[PDB]
């Protein structure tokens, strides 16, 4: 979430892309809300009453990924489960080259192939994928299929990292701090000192919004009082 102009521009882009049936590629670091953007593409589309299915490609080994996406024997895969809806594939760049070619087969031909006896399955799925890799760099290296990229990247949504939305950092920090005050029953958030603000604004936030929420919640809890402003931002609890 947030309100920097670069983020508002993303929301505008998403509102125009959502009604299309074309695949959308989301590029962004961890904690920038890629799955929320994918969900927004679905719910602003004509498919909104259909299924919204997610899969993280990085999480499964190659055989398990293959079966989870395309099914086997019956274990229906994620494409089948997303029929009439939207399938979100996260960490796309980790997909093995076998899975990449099979993904292209389903995209251009619009159907899954069955082992023996079973006829192929036709599927109608809107695809949204996400990564933080440099996919054109991977194409040059031969670790990502050029023909798949020629097809998947109809258009690209680039999510700005928190460090490039500096105006959003104190806005969101205040929001998360207030919510933590409610959780631990403090009567009022007593504010951030200038030292705290320097700490927040100078940090690069590799975990972006998710990390900001955790750091601020921990800091409010450790502070534990409404009697004076929060001075000590605990970035590293280790």
Numbering used by the authors: 9 to 81, 91 to 255
Sentences from the paper on this structure:
Bacterial enhancer binding proteins (bEBPs) are specialized AAA+ proteins that are required to activate the sigma54-dependent transcriptional complexes. As transcriptional activators, bEBPs function to catalyze the conversion of RPc to RPo, causing the RNAP-σ54 holoenzyme to isomerize and promoter DNA to melt, leading to transcription initiation. In order to understand the biochemical properties of E108Q and to provide a structural basis for the ‘Glutamate Switch’ pair, we determined the crystal structures of E108Q mutant of PspF AAA+ domain (PspF1–275E108Q) in the absence of nucleotide (APO), and in the presence of Mg-ATP or Mg-ADP.
The crystals diffracted to 1.6–1.8 Å and have the same space group and unit cells as those of WT proteins and are thus subsequently rebuilt and refined using WT protein structures as templates. In the mutant structures, on the contrary, E108Q in the ADP bound state as well as in the APO state also interacts with N64. This conformation, which enables the ‘Glutamate Switch’ pair to interact, is linked to the ability of PspF being able to engage with its target, the RPc. Such a conformation could contribute to the ability of E108Q to bind RPc and move RPc along the pathway of transcription activation despite its slow ATPase activity.
